[PDB]
Amino acid sequence: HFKEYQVIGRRLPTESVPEPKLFRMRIFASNEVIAKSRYWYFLQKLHKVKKASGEIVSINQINEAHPTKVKNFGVWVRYDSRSGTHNMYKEIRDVSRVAAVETLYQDMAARHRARFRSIHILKVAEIEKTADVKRQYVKQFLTKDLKFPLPHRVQKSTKTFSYKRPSTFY
Amino acid sequence: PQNDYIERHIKQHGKRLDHEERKRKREARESHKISERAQKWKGKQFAKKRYAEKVSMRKKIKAHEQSK
Amino acid sequence: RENKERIFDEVREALDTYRYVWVLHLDDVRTPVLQEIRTSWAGSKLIMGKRKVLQKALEYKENLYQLSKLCTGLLFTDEDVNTVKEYFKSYVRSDYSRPNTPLTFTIPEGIVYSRGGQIPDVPMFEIPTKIKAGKITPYLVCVRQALILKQFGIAASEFKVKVSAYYDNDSS
Amino acid sequence: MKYIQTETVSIKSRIVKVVTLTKNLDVTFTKVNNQLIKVAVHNGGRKHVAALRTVKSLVDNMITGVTKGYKYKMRYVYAHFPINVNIFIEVRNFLGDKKIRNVPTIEFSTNVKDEIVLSGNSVEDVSQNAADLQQIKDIRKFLDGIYVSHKGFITE
RNA sequence: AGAACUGGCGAUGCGGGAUGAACCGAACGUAGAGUUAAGGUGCCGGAAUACACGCUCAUCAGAACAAAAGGUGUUAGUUCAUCUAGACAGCCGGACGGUGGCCAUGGAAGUCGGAAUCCGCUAAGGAGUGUGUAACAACUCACCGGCCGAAUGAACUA
RNA sequence: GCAGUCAAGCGGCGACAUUGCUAUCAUACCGAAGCAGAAUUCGGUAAGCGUCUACUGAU
Numbered sequence A: 001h002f003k004e005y006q007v008i009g010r011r012l013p014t015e016s017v018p019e020p021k022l023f024r025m026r027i028f029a030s031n032e033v034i035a036k037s038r039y040w041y042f043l044q045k046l047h048k049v050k051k052a053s054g055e056i057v058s059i060n061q062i063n064e065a066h067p068t069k070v071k072n073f074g075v076w077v078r079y080d081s082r083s084g085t086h087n088m089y090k091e092i093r094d095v096s097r098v099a100a101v102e103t104l105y106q107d108m109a110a111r112h113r114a115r116f117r118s119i120h121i122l123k124v125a126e127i128e129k130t131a132d133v134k135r136q137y138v139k140q141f142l143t144k145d146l147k148f149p150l151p152h153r154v155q156k157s158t159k160t161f162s163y164k165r166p167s168t169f170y
Numbered sequence B: 001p002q003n004d005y006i007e008r009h010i011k012q013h014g015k016r017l018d019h020e021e022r023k024r025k026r027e028a029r030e031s032h033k034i035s036e037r038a039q040k041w042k043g044k045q046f047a048k049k050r051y052a053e054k055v056s057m058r059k060k061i062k063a064h065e066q067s068k
Numbered sequence C: 001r002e003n004k005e006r007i008f009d010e011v012r013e014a015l016d017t018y019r020y021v022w023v024l025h026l027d028d029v030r031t032p033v034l035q036e037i038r039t040s041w042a043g044s045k046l047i048m049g050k051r052k053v054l055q056k057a058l059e060y061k062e063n064l065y066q067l068s069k070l071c072t073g074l075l076f077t078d079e080d081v082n083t084v085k086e087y088f089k090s091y092v093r094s095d096y097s098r099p100n101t102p103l104t105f106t107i108p109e110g111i112v113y114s115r116g117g118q119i120p121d122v123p124m125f126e127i128p129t130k131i132k133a134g135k136i137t138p139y140l141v142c143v144r145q146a147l148i149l150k151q152f153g154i155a156a157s158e159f160k161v162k163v164s165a166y167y168d169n170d171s172s
Numbered sequence D: 001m002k003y004i005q006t007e008t009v010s011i012k013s014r015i016v017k018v019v020t021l022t023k024n025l026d027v028t029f030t031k032v033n034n035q036l037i038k039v040a041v042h043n044g045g046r047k048h049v050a051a052l053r054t055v056k057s058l059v060d061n062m063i064t065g066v067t068k069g070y071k072y073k074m075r076y077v078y079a080h081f082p083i084n085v086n087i088f089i090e091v092r093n094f095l096g097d098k099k100i101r102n103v104p105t106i107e108f109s110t111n112v113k114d115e116i117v118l119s120g121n122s123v124e125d126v127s128q129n130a131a132d133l134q135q136i137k138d139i140r141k142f143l144d145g146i147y148v149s150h151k152g153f154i155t156e
Numbered sequence E: 001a002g003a004a005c006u007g008g009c010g011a012u013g014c015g016g017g018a019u020g021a022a023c024c025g026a027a028c029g030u031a032g033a034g035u036u037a038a039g040g041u042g043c044c045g046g047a048a049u050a051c052a053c054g055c056u057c058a059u060c061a062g063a064a065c066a067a068a069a070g071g072u073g074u075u076a077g078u079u080c081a082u083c084u085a086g087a088c089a090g091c092c093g094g095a096c097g098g099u100g101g102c103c104a105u106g107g108a109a110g111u112c113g114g115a116a117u118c119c120g121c122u123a124a125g126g127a128g129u130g131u132g133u134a135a136c137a138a139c140u141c142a143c144c145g146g147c148c149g150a151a152u153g154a155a156c157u158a
Numbered sequence F: 001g002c003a004g005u006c007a008a009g010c011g012g013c014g015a016c017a018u019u020g021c022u023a024u025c026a027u028a029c030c031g032a033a034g035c036a037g038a039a040u041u042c043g044g045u046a047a048g049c050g051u052c053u054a055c056u057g058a059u
Helices: A032-046 A097-112 A136-142 B005-013 B019-038 B042-065 C002-014 C031-039 C051-057 C064-068 C081-090 C144-151 D046-067 D123-135
Strands: A003-009 A023-029 A059-061 A071-079 A086-094 A119-126 C020-024 C044-047 C074-077 C093-095 C157-159 C163-168 D015-018 D021-024 D028-031 D037-042 D070-077 D084-086 D089-092 D101-103 D106-108 D115-120 D145-150
Touching (some): A003 A097, A032 A059, A086 A097, A086 A136, B019 B042, C020 C064, C020 C081, C064 C163, C081 C163, D015 D046, D070 D123, D101 D123
Antiparallel strands (some): A003 A023, A003 A059, C020 C074, C044 C074, D070 D145, D089 D101
16 A cells, blocks of 8 residues: 655765755655655656765654545646656545545556656645636536436346346446 | 530529538538548558648648738 | 727726716617717717626726616717707618518519519529529518518618617716 | 536336327436426446437427427429329329339428428428438439428428 | 677476467475465466456457558647636627729629738728629628627647 | 758757659449530449369269
8 A cells, every 4th residue: 555754865964064955855655665765766866966875864654634534635746658758737536645646646557557667746735725626527526415326336246146137226 | 515504504593402501511521521531551641631731731821820 | 808908998088088978779780870970970989899898897986887787889978968869869770671670572473683573673591482494483571581671682670879878977 | 527417298218208209218317397307317428428418309309399390391393304293102204214213291282383291290200201202414404303492390 | 791798508307478499487316295486367277257546349459560640539638828808609790981992804893813902990890711793792701799607719748 | 862941859860742854444322523415534332243181973
């Protein structure tokens, strides 16, 4: 499962310059090792400090204050494909940031065939008010007292035979 | 026979009772027909013709746009 | 888009440039008639535009937005109300027929004419027309009626300019 | 986008009745007040959007036909060879063609020369009959033939 | 063709790619007990028709090259403008005066030919985008007025 | 091929247009041509007919 880890950067302090630039950033990854690897990869491109000269000080997890509150997360993404890299922006309705980023990755794999290697997370923020959701398919769920059915339900059974031929009513 | 035989016939009897409607419908179907043919060696010729027409139209529009 | 700003500024400037503000109920008239009305005098100016734009422009002044909705013809004039209303109620022009706007015109069952044969004429809609090896060959009208009348140059529409509301530029 | 919801008679399975005309139709209806019929499609795609719209148009056409009906007026002309039509409907003598032609409320129209009028409650049936009658060598040289004049209603 | 370097075969089993020298794991005493790799889990085939995201109906989809384009095919985004002063479409109406703008023609009044496009006014308009005229005329295209009620119009990118 | 207004990208190149000689022949439901009619060619569709393994007779 995905997770959020916070990492900082204080590339080894040269003489008379302790704690340089306090390079703080947030990383989304499953385990700590992957989080550190992605942090190093991002640092190697955002600036010119190499991993050999760098040093990880501390890694702390950041959960969600209200993991039971539905939010319309705004997602800014920079990724690359067979063509040159280009920024992208998307909005996802999810309870938690980790779930939102997981669905973002799944959608990117679905439509854009992208993966963790080619996906870079720019920033994630919550939409504080309605009508700010540009994407129509996300604003759709924000209507007053939205109610819809689920026609043609699917079902599974352990037995390989049935004498009823049940209907898909739902 | 005469210098305007078909022209005389057209001017004296016009065209079919629904020639205008049929021609308008056929022209309307051109957009659908072109798209259908684009997806159905002839493909190379069709693509080349479409690209040439697009290039010519774009050039004509761009050159004449200088008037404004 | 910027065309709306032009009308906005023109109205907001000409509001105080004339003694009286009047609204005219005209929305379908031939341009030559409108030009003749405009040039009939120099002390008044014809104002037209989008109804909503006029509502937004017309608050600039007390009770100005009340009659603005009855414009989209609007007239700025300095002459007395009596002269303007006398001209409006006396001025009349036989314009082209408009949809559902009474003569006994009837198309003869025989050859058709530019005027429909009403005058003693120059030989030339879903009606059962047919071509007689070069010629074309009753029908009556009293929206298709307006089109038929226009095709024959009939101008039975005796349109007259009218005024709806009165507003004072200095006292509303 | 991925749509979630879009929108004497009776509503039931895809067999429908209007009062009479009947037709056979993946959508649902609701007899809220017997005056307006709701049409709803859920979780549909691009195809569903088009499918939903055509159902409403067909229902409206059936209602209009039941309440007003449709009458596709037709007429024909001839130059040299008279066109012989008899009413089963038959066409003979056109252009001297010995191959008599046959076509499956049809009657002639009075006070209009060579006019034939077709009428029926169902719009589709009348339109199909008119098209079949119209369907039955320079193209522009022959003005003769049978063509639709106007698709007016029965209760003009 | 000449030729510098490192790995396998050479002399190399066995598992898998259904089919194989150039591939992946693995190199070897006969055996009992459990876990793997490649490779697999609908059947021939021993193993879940497992869970979640959407993608695609191919008129032979899908399981080393023609790859530059076309689709009013589809699923999602970047840019420029309009946008509650009322989005696009759909309708009704305006769509004008000098004017038959200058030249010959039988004729050309905007649309058979040569070149400028003067310009009043308006909410709005070209000496005209086409149908159309023997020569007129009429509709109309971009451009504007009224109904409508919100997000839309155009090019690219995955 | 030569030089070029040529120009989406783009490290000084560049598909696009233009300027100089040097899977049917008929058999047709279908549309076009300035096809008055026959005739005609064109895009149309179809290869239908035109133009020691194996048994050809057997038990």
